[PDB]
């Protein structure tokens, strides 16, 4: 039920707020604006008497006109060169982004990742891909703990000399008894010969307490 | 005329700028002195022989804070490189047209060294110090552990351009 | 890196009314240049956001500071001074080296470079996040790392004593916790001695922070070269607009002014392209730094040779001018 | 008028040859700058690899 409610709320939140898919829209706007600027830079006359070839060809003979034509040619070549350079830089940036997307598809979608803050905030559970114009959208499903509680703890336990260390988990106490639990979810359990292992005497561990182990 | 930005013509050399007095020493066969980027900065005077310096009278940086056209037409102005009704002094320059407050909110329009501006209610333009977030302090000890009892499953979206 | 802005009219024409009228034909070019540089500047303030704004709440350090035998009184801020810094942070800040109209008007005898480049329309913008806020972010990160461990990176922070956290980390690298629990004092002494000697080594070497100095030197040299390139006449009779306007009528001065305009425009274009390339490089470096902060500070990483040489234990962040410094703690057989 | 400096220096006096020499200088400088920019971009890609 939590998963279903989460996906429904994600759908509603995407529907409600237009200002969500900023990056792809920015890419499209950048491209369109670049071409529009290239189109409208034709009106400039780079030192020539006019910005129209027809006027120069109509008012001047060839030997007086090649100079104006040459000035215009150099200006327009420079404009095209600038456009190409900007396109190359943007292509490099998009290549880096696509490499990151491919890595994320390889790791978060085809497996489970141990890296922190790579496939979502929290302990990663799984991921799902969705297409979009010129892009991809990853839905990350993760785990988050909450509703914490205080307890009293001690590193080891003295059991007549054989100090006991927890095989896995943490030693906790509610005030009268002692238990060994797992780190994330609270679930206490009684102590037996398992869950523990012995190494050394109870005269070197700083914080070891006196208790008993109900080994069968 | 001195200490005023004026149009000047010294022996045919024309220009626009402010005249001042300096201590440069000119050899008798020299009349002009130019800077590193070949700009005439030191000039003698044909009458009352002396050395004077020329400095341009345009200098500074100006920014315009606006809420947008279809919100209002009120505007604040940020002058960098100055030390000044509503005037506020920041390390990034003087700010005119905004009201200084003591509260702390998020950032709407970044201004400079830790100052943000916003348009809020009659409405007005307010400048303040941006807040880094809430304040928390957990209690360290050597006997206390904190263990969660419940959990939750979260779904988040990430968007990446491809081509 | 540094955020800069340029004014075309001041740089090219320089308060000339005969100029700035022939410049209109090229106007649509300059509106591009700024629209590039702005795109750089807004990105810079964004970069610092992905490195230090990982956390959301400012944590406060405890006042008791027992921590078994471990001693952190070189990383945590020292309250008995301004700026709320750390001695290591103080050394880092001091090691890296880096004005109203009246100031530049009175400072003529000594030819300041900053005034010279400000009179030609080149301006430097301040960063949004100040140094004190960066220090506060780092202090919160250290407090969360010390008292809560790796838990505060995913969900609410949970308290845990330091020796238990160290035992967990040894269990992570592949050695049983009983090894730590019975060798606490020697390990703590080794850690303290390592911190002391790393501070001493940082103090001893002057040329240790090469990269940040390289960045600032590159920016300064680029701006100075842009300023000095105004003395070149691109085929005209002179490099001074006033001489041309004083010795020639407008129809003849048109050609020389056009030549100068084209030369200065291409110089500005070259500068902008170089800035864009350097910004891309800095973006890559910042992304790497953000990933390192996410994986070596908020958790223990298993990648080989990623968070230091040897088996990884933990890492500590420190701020620096235009940069970050990571202190990695590693285990070696 | 030509792509060879020798022809220009053989047919014209310095004052008139200066214009063509300047044009050639500007063109070749532009070519060199384009080459350098492309080399920088390729170097960035190689560094990433
Ligand atoms: C942590 O180490 C510092 C550095 O040695 C200790 O500060 C020293 O304290 C002694 C006695 O108070 C002074 O004589 C030294 O001059 C101090 N050194 C410095 C560099 O200031 C500090 O006491 C240690 N703290 C703990 C809890 O062990
Ligand atoms: C744990 O103890 C601290 C300090 O006594 C207290 O602030 C906190 O609220 C306690 N936790 C719970 C869940 O009550
Ligand atoms: C602690 O847990 C034990 C386990 O059953 C229980 O008997 C005891 O009442 C608990 N004490 C408190 C104070 O909750
Ligand atoms: C925890 O710290 C207090 C403060 O000095 C100390 O008295 C106590 O012995 C410590 N706990 C253990 C288990 O040593
Ligand atoms: C644990 O027991 C030993 C001997 O049985 C005794 O010497 C020691 O004081 C006890 N510790 C505590 C905390 O009661
Ligand atoms: C030049 O003549 C004017 C006459 O008005 C006089 O005021 C000025 O002092 C003279 N200059 C010199 C250098 O003699
Ligand atoms: C804000 O704080 C300043 C300094 O503490 C104080 O003088 C002022 O009255 C406060 N209120 C306003 C509206 O500025
Ligand atoms: C855990 O949370 C769920 C929903 O948030 C709730 O139904 C349930 O009662 C909670 N259980 C505990 C032990 O907090």
Author numbering:
A (entry chain C): 921 to 1136
B (entry chain C): 534 to 617, 640 to 676, 685 to 726
C (entry chain A): 727 to 824, 831 to 1065
D (entry chain B): 969 to 1017
What does the report in the manuscript say about this coordinate set?
Animal coronaviruses (CoVs) CX1 (formerly named BtSY2) and BANAL-20-52 are phylogenetically closely related to severe acute respiratory syndrome coronavirus 2 (SARS-CoV-2), and CX1 is the first observed animal betaCoV carrying naturally occurring Y501 in its receptor-binding domain (RBD) of the spike (S) protein, a residue related to human adaptation and broader host range. Additionally, both S proteins lack the PRRA insertion on site 681, resulting in the absence of furin-cleavage site (FCS) facilitating S1 subunit dissociation. Determination and analysis of cryo-EM structures of their S proteins and RBD/hACE2 complexes revealed that Y501 shows a synergetic effect with R498 and inter-replaceability with H498 for hACE2 binding.
For both S proteins, only a closed conformation was observed, with all three RBDs in the down state. The RMSD of CX1 and BANAL-20-52 protomers from the PT are 1.798 Å and 1.692 Å, respectively. Particularly, the opening angles between N-terminal domain (NTD) and RBD of CX1 and BANAL-20-52 protomers are smaller than that of D614G, indicating that NTD and RBD clamp adjacent RBD more tightly than D614G. Notably, N370-glycan forms van der Waals (vdw) interactions with Q493 of the adjacent RBD, thus strengthening the RBD-RBD interaction and stabilizing the down state of RBDs. Additionally, in S proteins of PT and two related CoVs, the residues adjacent to site 372 form a two-turn α-helix (365-373), whereas residues of D614G only form one turn (365-379). In turn, we introduced T372A to CX1 pseudovirus, which demonstrated a drastic increase in the entry efficiency, consistent with a previous report.
